[PDB]
Amino acid sequence: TLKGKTALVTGSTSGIGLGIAQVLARAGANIVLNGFGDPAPALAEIARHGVKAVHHPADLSDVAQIEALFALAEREFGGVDILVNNAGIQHVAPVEQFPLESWDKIIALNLSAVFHGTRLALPGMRARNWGRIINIASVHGLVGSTGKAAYVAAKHGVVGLTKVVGLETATSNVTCNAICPGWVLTPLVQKQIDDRAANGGDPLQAQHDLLAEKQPSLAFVTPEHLGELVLFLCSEAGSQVRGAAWNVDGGWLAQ
Amino acid sequence: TLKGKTALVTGSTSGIGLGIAQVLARAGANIVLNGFGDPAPALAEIARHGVKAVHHPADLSDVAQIEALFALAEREFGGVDILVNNAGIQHVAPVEQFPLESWDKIIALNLSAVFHGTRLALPGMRARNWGRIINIASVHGLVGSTGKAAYVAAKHGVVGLTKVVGLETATSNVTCNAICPGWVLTPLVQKQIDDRAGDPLQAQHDLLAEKQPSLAFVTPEHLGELVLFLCSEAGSQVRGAAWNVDGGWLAQ
Amino acid sequence: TLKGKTALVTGSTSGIGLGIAQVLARAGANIVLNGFGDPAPALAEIARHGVKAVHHPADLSDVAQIEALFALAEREFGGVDILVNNAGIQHVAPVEQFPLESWDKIIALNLSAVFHGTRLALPGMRARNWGRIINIASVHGLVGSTGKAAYVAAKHGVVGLTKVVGLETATSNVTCNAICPGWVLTPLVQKQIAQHDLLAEKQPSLAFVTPEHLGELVLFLCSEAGSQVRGAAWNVDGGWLAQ
Amino acid sequence: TLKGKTALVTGSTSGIGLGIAQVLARAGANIVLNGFGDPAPALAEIARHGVKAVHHPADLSDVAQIEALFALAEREFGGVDILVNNAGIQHVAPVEQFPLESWDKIIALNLSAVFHGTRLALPGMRARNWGRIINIASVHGLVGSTGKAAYVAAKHGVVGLTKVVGLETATSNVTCNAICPGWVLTPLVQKQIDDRDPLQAQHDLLAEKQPSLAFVTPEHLGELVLFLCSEAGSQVRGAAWNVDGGWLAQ
Ligand SMILES: NC(=O)c1ccc[n+]([C@@H]2O[C@H](COP(=O)([O-])OP(=O)(O)OC[C@H]3O[C@@H](n4cnc5c(N)ncnc54)[C@H](O)[C@@H]3O)[C@@H](O)[C@H]2O)c1
Ligand SMILES: NC(=O)c1ccc[n+]([C@@H]2O[C@H](COP(=O)([O-])OP(=O)(O)OC[C@H]3O[C@@H](n4cnc5c(N)ncnc54)[C@H](O)[C@@H]3O)[C@@H](O)[C@H]2O)c1
C-alpha cells in the first residue's frame, strides 16, 4: 500500500511520532526516524515490519540540523514522499511568567521547524508529482488553554501554515493537512499529570481530572489511531483533502 | 471488517449515497438503501459485493415515511449500526426571493431528517454499545455562498447537531461526526459538464475555480472511504467533528 | 445617532429583546416591539425615550403572523431600517428523548423566523439604500452542549444564514451580522439555575453578559464603523469560545 | 469616554495604528505612539485633541527595544491601561522559496512582539484592576492565502495567543481580544491603487477576497477598539472579531 514510499517522521523516538512511524512501516513505507533519546527501540520497532529505517538525531531548533536530516533522507532513500512534522515540546506558565527562552524554544520547534521541514520536502514532492505533508498540530491550534501561551500560538501557527501550503499545492498531487489531537498519554502529558499530582497526591486521580476537564469521552486518543489517520490521508481518498485541520479529540472542540 | 454490521445510507439510489453504500458493502456491511426512483440499479450494485441489501423509498420530509424506513431496517436486520445521513437538495435564489416551499423542504430534508434519523437510530446503538452516525454536511455547513440561504442554514444546523450528538454519546462506543465535502463529481454535475458540443476539463476548471483551489472533484468513493475510516477503531475518539474534504475550499 | 430610523426587535416584550430595544430607542430609533406576555411595561420603557413605540404580539413560529408583524411596521412606519432577529426559546433533553414538537417549534422560531424576518425586511432596505439586520444567535451557533439538539442546530443555521445575507448584501449599504452571547442572566437562564455553577462549566469570566452590553454592540453594528462588518458572527461570552 | 487613560499603540506613525490612536485621543486617552519615520504629523494629529502624546521609535523585533518602549510608558504615564498591538510586516513568496530571514522577521514583529508587549503591560493592568489588550491580527489569523506562509502563521499565532490571555484574565477586569481586518486602506495600499481608474483598481484589487469591494478604514478600526474599550466590551474575552467586508463569510 505504501511500498515504494519513504516517510520521514520528526520526533518519532517516542509518543505520537513513534506510533505514526510504526503504522506507516506496517503499510510498507521506508522510514527516517528523528528525535532525542535512545533511537534503538524505535529502529527495532520499525525493522519488525520488514521495512528499512535510519534515524538522525537533528535538534530541529537548529535550521542547519534540519537540513542535515533531510540530506540523510535524500542520500539513504532518494527523497521524502511523506513528511510527518510531529516533533514538539510543552511548557506551562501564566503569560507574564512565561520564560522568554521557552517562548522562543516552543516557537522554534513547534512552529518554525514545521515550516523548515515543509520547505525542504516540497521541491522533491512537486518534482515527483506526488507528496503528503501532515502536521501534528493540536486542539490547541483551534482553541486555547490557560498557561499555554507559547504552544497555543505555535499550534495555531501550524494550522495557518497548513492552510497556506495546502492552498499553494492545490493544483498538484501534493497535499498538506494537519491532525489536531486531543490528549494522548505520552511523556509530554504525564509531565502535566505529575505536576498536577505534585500538591495533593494521586497520579491516577490527577490523570482522570486532566482528561475529564477537557475531553468528554474520558478516553485518551492513541498514537496508533493517529497513525491510521495519517495513513488515510496518504491514500487516494485523501487526494482532495487540502489545507484541512482534522481533530481527533474525544469531543474537546465540539463544546 | 464491517462483516456483521448494518448500514443505512439515505439518498443512496444514485450519486453520493450510492458511492458511499458501495464502499460499506465491499467492507462487508449489510445495506438499507433509500431514495426516489427505481431501486433496482442500486440494489444490484450492492448485492454483487456478497452482502444483503433492501431498499425503502421513504420521502424524508415526512416523519412517518422516515419511521417506515427505520421499521424496514429493523424488520430485515435488527436495526442500524452505521447511519449515514446523506441528502441531496439544493435551490439557488437571493434570500428575499427565496421560495418558501424551497426553504421548508431544504430545512426538512437537509436538517430535520438528520435529527429524525438520529433519534431513531441511537437507542439501538447504545443498547448494542457500538454505533456510528455520519452526517454528510457540506462546506456550506462551515461557510456561506450567495443565493444559498436554505442550504447553508440546514448544513450549518447539521454541523451543530453533530456536535450535540457527538457530546451526548462521548462516553460510549457510539460516535457522531460530519463530513463536509466541496464540489463532488455527481451524475448531475457530470451532466452540467458534458453539456459541451468541446472541452470538459476547462468546463470543470470554470466551475470549480472560484471556490475550489484544486480545480478537481471530490468523488463519492473518496467519501465512502472516509465513512469507512470513521467506522474503524481509529475512528473511536473522533466525536462531534466536522471534517472537510474540499480541494482547499475552507483553507481560503 | 439613529433618529428617524425604525427598528423592529423580535422577542422584545422582555429581556435581551427589551434591553436591545431600549438602546436603539435611546439612540433615537422608533421601535416596533414583539412578543408575548403584555407590552405596556415595554411600551412605556421605549417611549420614556420620546420615540414612537408600537407593538405586535405575533407568534413567530407562524409565518402568516410574522407577515402581520411586518405589515404593521410597514403601515406605522413605511417599513424597517433595522431588523433585530431575537425571539428564541429553549428545550433541554437528550436527542433521542427530544420532543418532536419541541424540535419543530425551536427550528421555526429560532431559525425559520429569522429567514422570514429577513426576506420581509430586506426589499425595503435595498430600496431605501440602507439597512441593518442583526441576528441574536448564541455561543451555541458555534459549539454544542449536551441536551440542546434543536437549539444548537437552529443557532448554527442562523450563523450560516447570516453569512449568505452578509455576502448577498456586501455590495450595498445593508449589512447582516450575528451577535453570539454566552450566558445572560434572564428568566430563561435562571430557569437553568448558585449561579457560579451554571457559569463555571461554560463561561470562564464567571460573570453574566448583560442585555445592555448586547444593545450597545447592536448600536455599534448600526453605526458607520459597522459599515464593512458583514456576515460576521461576533461572540460576547466571557471566554466561552476561547477554550 | 477615556479621560484619564493611557493607550499605547504600536505601528502608529501612520496607517491603521495612527487611525486607532486618533480615535482614542478623541475619546480622551493619553497616547504613546510607536513606529518609524518622522513622528511629527502623528504627534500633532493627537495634540489636535488636547491629550499628551509621546513617541518611541523602537524596533519591536528587538526585545530590549520593546522593553525600553514600556519603560518610557512607565515613566511618562505610570503605565499602559490600553495596549494595542498593531505593528505588522509582510512578504510574499511561495513556501519553498520563503526567505529564511523574512520568516524569522515576520514571526518576530507580527507574533513574538505581541507576546512581549503583553507580558509587560499585563502586571500593571492587573494591579490597577482595569485593562484592555487588543491585538490587530488579520483575516489571515483565521484563513490562509497563497504566498503568505509567515504572515498567516504569525497572525494565526496571534489569534491563539489572544485566546490564552483572554482566558488567563477572564476572572479580572482585564480583557484581551483580536480585531481581524480584511483589506484596509493604508498608505502602502493607497500607493498600490495610485499605480494602477482609482475605483476600478480598488475593485480589481478587492474582488477575490473582499466581497464588498470597499475598504475597511483605520477610523472604523479605531471605533471598534473604542467599543472593546467601553463597558459593553467587559465580557468580550479571547475573541477574534473580523471586520472584513465579507472575507470570512465565504
Ligand atoms: N500528547 C498529546 O496530548 C498531544 C496532543 C496534541 C498534539 N500533540 C503533539 O504531538 C507531538 C508529539 O508529542 P508527544 O506527546 O508524542 O510528545 P513526546 O514528548 O512523547 O515526544 C516528542 C518527540 O519529539 C522529540 N523532540 C523533542 N524535542 C526535539 C527537538 N528539538 N528536535 C527534534 N526532536 C525533538 C522527542 O525526542 C520525541 O521524539 C508534539 O507536536 C505535540 O505538540 C500532543
Ligand atoms: N439568555 C441567554 O443566556 C442567551 C444566550 C445566548 C443567546 N440568547 C438569545 O437571546 C434571545 C432572547 O432570549 P432571552 O434570554 O431574553 O430570553 P427571554 O425568554 O427572557 O425573552 C424571549 C422573548 O421572546 C419572546 N418570544 C418567545 N416565544 C416567541 C414566539 N413564539 N414568537 C414571538 N416571540 C416570542 C418572548 O415573549 C420574550 O419576549 C434568544 O434568541 C436567545 O437564544 C440568550
Tab-separated table of C-alpha atoms in Angstrom, chain C:
chain	number	residue	atom	x	y	z
C	1	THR	CA	-27.490	58.778	16.451
C	2	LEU	CA	-30.414	56.853	14.733
C	3	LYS	CA	-33.147	59.489	14.671
C	4	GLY	CA	-35.928	58.773	12.154
C	5	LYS	CA	-34.890	55.156	11.690
C	6	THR	CA	-37.268	52.310	12.614
C	7	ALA	CA	-36.023	49.213	14.423
C	8	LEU	CA	-38.171	46.083	14.652
C	9	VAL	CA	-36.869	43.892	17.533
C	10	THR	CA	-38.379	40.376	17.818
C	11	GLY	CA	-38.944	38.937	21.296
C	12	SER	CA	-38.703	42.407	22.807
C	13	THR	CA	-41.501	42.366	25.367
C	14	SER	CA	-38.800	41.046	27.810
C	15	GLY	CA	-35.059	40.568	28.492
C	16	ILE	CA	-32.357	40.699	25.807
C	17	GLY	CA	-35.055	41.813	23.339
C	18	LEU	CA	-36.324	44.634	25.561
C	19	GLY	CA	-32.802	45.771	26.549
C	20	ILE	CA	-31.690	45.976	22.862
C	21	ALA	CA	-34.957	47.815	22.077
C	22	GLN	CA	-34.108	50.292	24.826
C	23	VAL	CA	-30.608	51.124	23.498
C	24	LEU	CA	-31.911	51.645	19.929
C	25	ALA	CA	-34.799	53.796	21.132
C	26	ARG	CA	-32.359	55.725	23.354
C	27	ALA	CA	-30.268	56.348	20.216
C	28	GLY	CA	-33.348	57.864	18.532
C	29	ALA	CA	-34.964	54.960	16.606
C	30	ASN	CA	-38.756	54.338	16.513
C	31	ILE	CA	-39.378	50.816	17.747
C	32	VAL	CA	-41.654	48.068	16.596
C	33	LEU	CA	-41.864	45.666	19.524
C	34	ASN	CA	-42.784	41.976	19.570
C	35	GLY	CA	-43.717	39.125	21.860
C	36	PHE	CA	-45.947	37.504	24.497
C	37	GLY	CA	-46.907	38.464	27.987
C	38	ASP	CA	-48.133	42.126	27.934
C	39	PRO	CA	-46.427	45.121	26.256
C	40	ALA	CA	-47.441	48.214	28.326
C	41	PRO	CA	-44.275	47.931	30.582
C	42	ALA	CA	-42.215	47.558	27.392
C	43	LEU	CA	-44.083	50.319	25.511
C	44	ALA	CA	-43.658	52.805	28.409
C	45	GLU	CA	-39.911	51.970	28.590
C	46	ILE	CA	-39.206	52.627	24.931
C	47	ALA	CA	-41.494	55.621	24.864
C	48	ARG	CA	-39.711	57.021	28.037
C	49	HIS	CA	-37.087	57.828	25.310
C	50	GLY	CA	-39.533	60.052	23.346
C	51	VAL	CA	-39.548	57.855	20.284
C	52	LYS	CA	-42.641	56.150	18.770
C	53	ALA	CA	-43.072	52.715	20.370
C	54	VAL	CA	-45.525	50.317	18.611
C	55	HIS	CA	-46.188	46.631	19.493
C	56	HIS	CA	-47.292	43.413	17.721
C	57	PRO	CA	-47.749	40.123	19.668
C	58	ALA	CA	-47.065	37.745	16.717
C	59	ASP	CA	-46.133	34.117	17.470
C	60	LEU	CA	-43.248	33.844	15.014
C	61	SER	CA	-43.456	30.057	14.745
C	62	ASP	CA	-46.417	31.080	12.430
C	63	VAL	CA	-45.397	32.504	9.007
C	64	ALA	CA	-48.696	34.394	8.489
C	65	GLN	CA	-48.311	36.124	11.866
C	66	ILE	CA	-44.681	37.161	11.088
C	67	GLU	CA	-46.085	38.775	7.904
C	68	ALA	CA	-48.744	40.679	10.074
C	69	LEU	CA	-45.984	41.978	12.448
C	70	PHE	CA	-44.210	43.330	9.373
C	71	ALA	CA	-47.401	44.681	7.811
C	72	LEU	CA	-47.639	46.839	10.988
C	73	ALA	CA	-44.093	48.178	10.640
C	74	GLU	CA	-44.999	48.878	7.009
C	75	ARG	CA	-48.083	50.835	8.000
C	76	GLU	CA	-46.979	52.767	11.042
C	77	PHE	CA	-43.562	53.484	9.564
C	78	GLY	CA	-43.088	52.823	5.848
C	79	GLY	CA	-41.048	49.728	6.816
C	80	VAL	CA	-37.951	48.507	8.682
C	81	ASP	CA	-34.413	50.122	8.617
C	82	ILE	CA	-33.018	47.900	11.474
C	83	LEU	CA	-34.051	44.290	11.947
C	84	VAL	CA	-33.069	42.541	15.116
C	85	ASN	CA	-33.996	38.831	14.910
C	86	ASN	CA	-34.004	37.969	18.590
C	87	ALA	CA	-37.062	35.898	19.590
C	88	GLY	CA	-35.929	32.494	20.970
C	89	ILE	CA	-36.923	29.580	23.134
C	90	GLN	CA	-35.158	26.511	24.645
C	91	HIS	CA	-35.857	22.799	25.493
C	92	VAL	CA	-33.258	20.674	27.317
C	93	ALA	CA	-33.372	16.902	26.555
C	94	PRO	CA	-31.078	14.191	25.138
C	95	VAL	CA	-31.557	13.867	21.379
C	96	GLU	CA	-33.382	10.537	21.483
C	97	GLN	CA	-35.827	11.880	24.126
C	98	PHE	CA	-36.251	15.248	22.368
C	99	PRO	CA	-39.935	16.042	21.783
C	100	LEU	CA	-40.813	16.132	18.155
C	101	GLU	CA	-42.911	19.289	18.512
C	102	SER	CA	-40.095	20.967	20.535
C	103	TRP	CA	-37.730	20.253	17.684
C	104	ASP	CA	-40.187	21.686	15.044
C	105	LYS	CA	-41.052	24.683	17.357
C	106	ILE	CA	-37.348	25.586	18.056
C	107	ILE	CA	-36.437	25.277	14.340
C	108	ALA	CA	-39.473	27.538	13.363
C	109	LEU	CA	-38.869	30.228	15.992
C	110	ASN	CA	-35.144	30.120	16.401
C	111	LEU	CA	-34.287	29.652	12.674
C	112	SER	CA	-37.129	29.892	10.129
C	113	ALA	CA	-38.483	33.203	11.635
C	114	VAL	CA	-35.054	34.807	11.101
C	115	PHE	CA	-35.138	33.983	7.416
C	116	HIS	CA	-38.839	35.172	7.258
C	117	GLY	CA	-37.979	38.464	9.004
C	118	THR	CA	-35.045	38.835	6.696
C	119	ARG	CA	-36.958	38.200	3.389
C	120	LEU	CA	-39.745	40.622	4.619
C	121	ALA	CA	-37.355	43.499	5.692
C	122	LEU	CA	-34.632	43.283	3.025
C	123	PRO	CA	-36.515	44.553	-0.059
C	124	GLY	CA	-37.422	47.793	1.764
C	125	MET	CA	-33.802	48.161	2.986
C	126	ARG	CA	-32.290	47.721	-0.557
C	127	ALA	CA	-34.908	50.197	-1.950
C	128	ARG	CA	-34.116	52.923	0.585
C	129	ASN	CA	-30.328	52.365	0.306
C	130	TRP	CA	-29.512	51.422	3.984
C	131	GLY	CA	-30.236	48.643	6.437
C	132	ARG	CA	-29.058	46.522	9.346
C	133	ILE	CA	-30.132	43.001	10.077
C	134	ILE	CA	-28.631	41.793	13.321
C	135	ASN	CA	-29.298	38.156	14.482
C	136	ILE	CA	-29.044	37.260	18.157
C	137	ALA	CA	-27.669	33.779	17.746
C	138	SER	CA	-25.698	32.289	20.645
C	139	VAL	CA	-22.392	30.682	21.563
C	140	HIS	CA	-24.470	27.575	20.531
C	141	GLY	CA	-24.299	28.730	16.969
C	142	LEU	CA	-20.544	27.995	17.163
C	143	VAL	CA	-20.198	24.985	19.591
C	144	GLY	CA	-22.661	22.454	21.009
C	145	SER	CA	-23.749	21.360	24.523
C	146	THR	CA	-25.483	18.240	25.718
C	147	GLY	CA	-29.279	18.360	25.720
C	148	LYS	CA	-29.541	21.095	23.076
C	149	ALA	CA	-30.027	19.280	19.809
C	150	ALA	CA	-32.674	21.700	18.396
C	151	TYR	CA	-31.211	24.848	19.798
C	152	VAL	CA	-27.666	24.200	18.624
C	153	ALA	CA	-28.965	23.225	15.128
C	154	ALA	CA	-31.143	26.394	14.907
C	155	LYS	CA	-28.411	28.798	16.056
C	156	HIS	CA	-25.734	27.206	13.787
C	157	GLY	CA	-28.295	27.705	10.993
C	158	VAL	CA	-28.648	31.377	11.893
C	159	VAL	CA	-24.876	31.838	11.791
C	160	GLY	CA	-24.801	30.232	8.290
C	161	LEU	CA	-27.808	32.211	7.062
C	162	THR	CA	-26.102	35.384	8.263
C	163	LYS	CA	-23.136	34.595	6.094
C	164	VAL	CA	-25.338	34.206	2.967
C	165	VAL	CA	-27.185	37.500	3.613
C	166	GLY	CA	-23.875	39.261	4.606
C	167	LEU	CA	-22.451	38.185	1.191
C	168	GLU	CA	-25.551	38.974	-0.831
C	169	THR	CA	-25.725	42.486	0.594
C	170	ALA	CA	-21.945	43.054	0.563
C	171	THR	CA	-22.163	45.452	-2.459
C	172	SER	CA	-24.978	47.563	-0.881
C	173	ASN	CA	-25.302	49.712	2.241
C	174	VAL	CA	-27.241	46.856	4.052
C	175	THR	CA	-25.298	44.566	6.247
C	176	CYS	CA	-26.233	41.436	8.032
C	177	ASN	CA	-24.452	40.058	11.083
C	178	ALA	CA	-24.952	37.833	14.165
C	179	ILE	CA	-24.099	38.510	17.822
C	180	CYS	CA	-23.391	35.258	19.730
C	181	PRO	CA	-23.786	35.794	23.505
C	182	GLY	CA	-22.862	33.412	26.303
C	183	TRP	CA	-24.933	33.277	29.485
C	184	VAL	CA	-27.164	36.275	30.125
C	185	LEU	CA	-28.998	36.411	33.482
C	186	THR	CA	-32.693	36.174	32.330
C	187	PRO	CA	-35.775	34.079	33.405
C	188	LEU	CA	-34.867	31.632	30.501
C	189	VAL	CA	-31.409	31.256	32.065
C	190	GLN	CA	-32.498	31.407	35.776
C	191	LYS	CA	-34.659	28.522	34.510
C	192	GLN	CA	-31.360	26.539	34.074
C	193	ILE	CA	-30.165	27.567	37.604
C	194	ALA	CA	-25.586	29.078	42.844
C	195	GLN	CA	-25.213	30.973	39.508
C	196	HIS	CA	-21.415	30.389	39.910
C	197	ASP	CA	-22.094	26.773	38.944
C	198	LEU	CA	-24.053	27.213	35.723
C	199	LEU	CA	-21.352	29.782	34.778
C	200	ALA	CA	-18.343	27.745	35.917
C	201	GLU	CA	-18.612	24.959	33.388
C	202	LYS	CA	-19.021	27.140	30.314
C	203	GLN	CA	-18.179	30.750	30.953
C	204	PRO	CA	-14.627	31.393	32.421
C	205	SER	CA	-15.276	35.003	33.485
C	206	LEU	CA	-17.854	33.627	35.933
C	207	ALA	CA	-19.911	36.691	35.126
C	208	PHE	CA	-23.043	37.249	33.088
C	209	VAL	CA	-23.225	39.219	29.847
C	210	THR	CA	-25.979	41.930	30.154
C	211	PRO	CA	-28.667	42.869	27.602
C	212	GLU	CA	-27.347	46.376	27.788
C	213	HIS	CA	-23.872	45.159	26.607
C	214	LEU	CA	-25.675	43.449	23.719
C	215	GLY	CA	-27.741	46.528	22.914
C	216	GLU	CA	-24.618	48.692	22.758
C	217	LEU	CA	-22.929	46.236	20.295
C	218	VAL	CA	-26.067	46.361	18.187
C	219	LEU	CA	-25.738	50.176	18.121
C	220	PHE	CA	-22.086	49.729	17.010
C	221	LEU	CA	-23.102	47.473	14.039
C	222	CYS	CA	-25.727	50.130	13.210
C	223	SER	CA	-23.053	52.890	13.058
C	224	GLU	CA	-20.731	53.930	10.124
C	225	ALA	CA	-17.906	51.781	11.691
C	226	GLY	CA	-20.003	48.609	11.297
C	227	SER	CA	-20.305	49.551	7.589
C	228	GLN	CA	-17.785	46.812	6.498
C	229	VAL	CA	-18.638	44.249	9.129
C	230	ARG	CA	-20.601	41.794	7.079
C	231	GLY	CA	-21.630	38.207	7.531
C	232	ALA	CA	-19.838	38.091	10.851
C	233	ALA	CA	-20.819	36.358	13.990
C	234	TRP	CA	-19.234	38.136	16.927
C	235	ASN	CA	-19.183	36.499	20.298
C	236	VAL	CA	-19.825	38.195	23.673
C	237	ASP	CA	-19.232	35.414	26.045
C	238	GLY	CA	-16.910	35.586	28.984
C	239	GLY	CA	-14.352	33.351	27.334
C	240	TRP	CA	-16.779	30.565	26.378
C	241	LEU	CA	-15.388	30.126	22.787
C	242	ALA	CA	-11.743	30.865	23.747
C	243	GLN	CA	-11.466	27.375	25.271
